[PDB]
Ligand binder design. Structure first.
Ligand SMILES: CC(=S)NC1=CO[C@H](CO)[C@@H](O)[C@@H]1O
Ligand SMILES: [Cl-]
Ligand SMILES: [Cl-]
Ligand SMILES: [Cl-]
Ligand SMILES: [Cl-]
Ligand SMILES: [Cl-]
Ligand SMILES: [Cl-]
Ligand SMILES: [Cl-]
Ligand SMILES: [Cl-]
Length: 499
């Protein structure tokens, strides 16, 4: 009977683990007459409608959203110790109430509520339920404010609707940032009006050849809009000065020898570089960042900086000295991969660490030295949170350059002391990147993202006090029938005792 439990989900059985769980008393039961009652604002109705949309198919209930009356489900904005993102959830026969300071907090509370409900809530046709929500109180706040998921759309392109699907997968677990890898050697995926061939030519293929694709400005604005309605701040990346072949192939004049290389359809790295010695390079960078800044309402622009292995250290430092201030010129905070830690991060910058256990002490020290010097740290170790990494040697998709990453390995660590010598106050949070050298459709994205995606969300959200593999894997095993009912393919790890 694992498809419809006799009894409700325990109040504590939630990913991420809530900061505080106080089970007690009888559950609330949603019945055909339940109303979703919201505050009288466009943003409170927005969350209510989002909740109503999640529940209507499987309940068959009308679930009207109103700002009058005493709804059995109440989303209220109120003072409280909940920050921009925390919430309180109270549940019992008198109703479910979710209280927060800001809409993002109500939305996060919605994400807990959908796991308190039974797996049948994922179905697109009406079900018995019963629509029970365990009784008690959850009081929940995030440990880290940077909790991001990356999608690589350069290696294989994914259109607006496929990004919206992936957006909805991550929203489940209280991620608050969506990092988009918009350019690389195999693709340029954002239309730039000052440099139109970047999209029309540089976007014309992908890994393995054939059609590629790109986002018109309107498509990209719709992605940003959609992400925002799921409370994801979009962090765009234009990788530079390496991983730049699609741009180089698009404009001969950007190449140091003035000859445009061919379009790249392979799956290797390191061979491309912008021309640090040419003035146009910085005209090009300034136009691109300018246009991307304008499309970007979030606070951050990612300039990459990884694997510039055809850029000698001194030219790479030079290049980064010049381009970093362009970002603040257009009003944004710079993010780079942690190679930037070795080219003088500007005030306010963050760096994303993608090293592994085999990384050497000198490289890790450079990153911890930048932390000491005030650079924020985003942690995404390649042998922890790279969702493109194989689980075992038998995984059919993915890469293995970082070894194999089973479910326990991905989950079982503490960002706060992970980097030797790094002040734990320098750690802004975690990211789970999903690179697409090997992935070309959304079902494939799912199989590599699930089941590790929730775990990295937990490292970003939950108190370290709640961290424990043996109890976490029980909570994680409970997702199986939810994912099955939703059509989310996932790797049935033997380490996880699946429900
Ligand atoms: C910042 C990083 S990770 N650079 C890269 C190396 O590893 C990834 C493969 O896992 C690849 O897609 C990407 O270009
Ligand atoms: Cl209606
Ligand atoms: Cl009233
Ligand atoms: Cl908000
Ligand atoms: Cl029914
Ligand atoms: Cl925030
Ligand atoms: Cl989903
Ligand atoms: Cl190749
Ligand atoms: Cl390679």
């Amino acid at each position: 009977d694992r498809k419809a439990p006799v009894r409700p989900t325990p109040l504590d059985r939630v990913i991420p683990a809530p900061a505080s769980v106080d089970p007690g008393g009888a559950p609330y039961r949603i019945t055909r007459g339940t109303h979703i009652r919201v505050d009288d604002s466009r943003e409170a109705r927005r969350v209510g409608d989002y909740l109503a949309d999640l529940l209507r198919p499987a309940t068959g209930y009308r679930l009207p959203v109103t700002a009058h009356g005493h709804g059995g489900i109440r989303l209220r904005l109120a003072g409280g110790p909940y920050g921009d993102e925390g919430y309180r959830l109270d549940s019992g026969p008198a109703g479910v109430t979710i209280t927060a300071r800001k809409a993002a907090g109500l939305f996060h509370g919605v994400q807990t509520l959908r796991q308190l409900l039974p797996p049948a809530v994922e179905k697109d046709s009406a079900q018995p339920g019963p629509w029970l929500v365990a009784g008690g109180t959850i009081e929940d706040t995030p440990r880290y404010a940077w909790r991001s998921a990356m999608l690589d759309v350069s290696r294989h392109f994914f259109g607006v609707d496929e990004v919206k699907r992936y957006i909805d997968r991550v929203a489940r677990y209280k991620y608050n940032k969506l990092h988009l890898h918009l350019s690389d050697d195999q693709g340029w995926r954002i239309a730039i009006d000052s440099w139109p061939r970047l999209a029309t030519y540089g976007g014309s293929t992908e890994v393995g050849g054939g059609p590629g694709g790109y986002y018109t400005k309107a498509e990209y604005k719709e992605i940003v809009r959609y992400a925002a309605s799921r409370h994801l701040e979009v962090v765009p990346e234009i990788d530079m000065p390496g991983h730049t072949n699609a741009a180089l192939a698009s404009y001969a004049e950007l190449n140091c020898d003035g000859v445009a290389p061919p379009l790249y359809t392979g799956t290797k790295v390191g061979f491309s570089s912008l021309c640090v010695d040419k003035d146009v390079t910085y005209d090009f960078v300034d136009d691109v960042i300018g246009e991307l800044a304008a499309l970007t309402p979030g606070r951050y622009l990612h300039i990459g900086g990884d694997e510039a292995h055809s850029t000698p250290k001194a030219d790479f430092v030079a290049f980064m000295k010049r381009v970093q201030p362009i970002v603040a010129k257009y009003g944004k905070t710079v993010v780079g991969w942690h190679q930037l830690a070795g080219a003088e991060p500007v005030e306010g910058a963050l760096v994303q660490y993608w090293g592994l256990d085999r990384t050497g002490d000198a490289e890790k020290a450079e990153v911890a030295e930048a932390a000491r010097n005030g650079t924020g740290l985003i942690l995404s170790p390649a042998d922890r949170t790279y969702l493109d990494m194989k689980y075992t040697k038998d995984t059919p998709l993915g890469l293995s350059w970082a070894g194999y990453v089973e479910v326990q390995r991905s989950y079982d660590w503490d960002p706060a002391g992970y980097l030797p010598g790094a002040p734990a106050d320098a750690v802004r949070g975690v990211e789970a990147p999903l690179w697409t050298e090997t992935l070309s459709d959304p079902d494939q994205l799912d199989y590599m993202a699930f089941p590790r995606l929730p775990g990295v969300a937990e490292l970003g959200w939950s108190p370290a006090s709640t961290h424990d593999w043996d109890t976490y894997k029980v909570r994680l095993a409970a997702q199986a029938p939810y994912w099955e009912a939703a059509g989310i393919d996932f790797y049935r790890s033997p380490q996880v005792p699946w429900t």
